[PDB]
């Protein structure tokens, strides 16, 4: 599940290693899904945002209208 | 404009449920097709050309879509007020797009 080779290793933010005592040890937010799910939605969005911004061969440059490309 | 004709029509809740259903409809979607503004003016100057309306769109980024400046005034719940305040923010936008 949280096998550290999942989600590009960023699953290490969500993993309670070892024979945890479910009552006293183990952070709460690591238990509920939607928080785990909302988090992965963050990281998964980054790769898109990264890849969209790694292909920025163009650089944005403003220009007065008169001498812009036709 | 939505008035109630159900169990919410008559008794003591006649008011607050009516007040709700209107403050819940306080919007007045002011619209105008930009191409309409491309008329002459009483000073004789052309009102809005390609150089001007370009400024207009970028002045209201998500607002001006499908070539119609859409201004939804949701500030006040008195709907007539939203018309006055809405038209207020409206002319200001043309005041700058005419720069």
């Amino acid at each position: 599940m949280h096998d550290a080779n999942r989600f590009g290793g960023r699953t290490a933010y969500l993993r309670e290693i070892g024979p945890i005592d479910h009552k006293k040890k183990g952070r709460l937010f690591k238990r509920d899904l939607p928080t785990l799910q909302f988090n992965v939605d963050v990281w998964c969005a980054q790769q898109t945002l990264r890849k969209q911004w790694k292909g920025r061969d163009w650089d944005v440059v403003e220009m007065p209208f008169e001498m812009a490309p036709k | 404009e939505q008035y109630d004709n159900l169990q919410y029509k008559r008794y003591d809740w006649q008011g607050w449920y009516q007040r709700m259903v209107d403050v819940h409809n306080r919007n007045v979607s002011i619209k105008c097709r930009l191409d309409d503004l491309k008329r002459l003016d009483a000073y004789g100057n052309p009102f809005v050309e390609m150089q001007t309306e370009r400024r207009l769109r970028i002045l209201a980024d998500h607002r001006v879509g499908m070539g119609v400046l859409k201004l939804d005034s949701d500030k006040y719940e008195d709907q007539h007020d939203n018309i006055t305040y809405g038209s207020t923010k409206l002319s200001e936008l043309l005041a700058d797009a005419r720069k």
């Binding site: 550290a4 290793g9 290490a12 290693i17 | -």
Partner: protein, 141 residues
């Protein structure tokens, strides 16, 4: 219904065992704090075992060659200053950018509690036997 049955009174004079116990426990709270805080800090000042996993490339390459060159020359003093903790070095190493993106994708790194072992941690028995008196969340040493 298991009709709700009462619990008896709290017992005579237990309150005195309460005001006492909570207090002198909160006093013990200080030393375990004072101990663990030192353990955390003095951990941060010490050296760690190197966070990388030598088994995987590009850290299989012999110490003479490979990324060990830049590790030995361009940033050597720095990687000692950062005390070889697995949080700064992977950030320092990413800054030099002379190895590209191979920090995260290619280079595999030691697990967490394997990377908090201090330098000269020869016996692997060590990484599990860190002291129990200190409450640190396994940042201590």
């Amino acid at each position: 219904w298991a009709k709700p049955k009462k619990r008896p009174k709290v017992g005579p004079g237990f309150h005195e065992k309460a005001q006492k116990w909570r207090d002198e426990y909160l006093l013990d709270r200080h030393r375990v704090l004072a101990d663990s805080l030192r353990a955390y800090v003095d951990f941060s000042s010490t050296k760690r075992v190197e966070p990388w996993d030598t088994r995987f490339a590009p850290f299989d390459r012999v110490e003479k060659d490979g990324v060990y060159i830049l590790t030995r020359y361009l940033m050597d003093d720095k990687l000692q200053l950062c005390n070889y903790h697995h949080r700064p070095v992977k950030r320092m190493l990413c800054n030099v950018g002379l190895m590209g993106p191979q920090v995260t994708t290619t280079a595999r790194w030691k697990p967490y509690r394997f990377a908090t072992n201090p330098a000269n941690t020869t016996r692997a028995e060590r990484t599990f036997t860190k002291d129990k008196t200190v409450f640190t969340g396994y940042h201590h040493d």
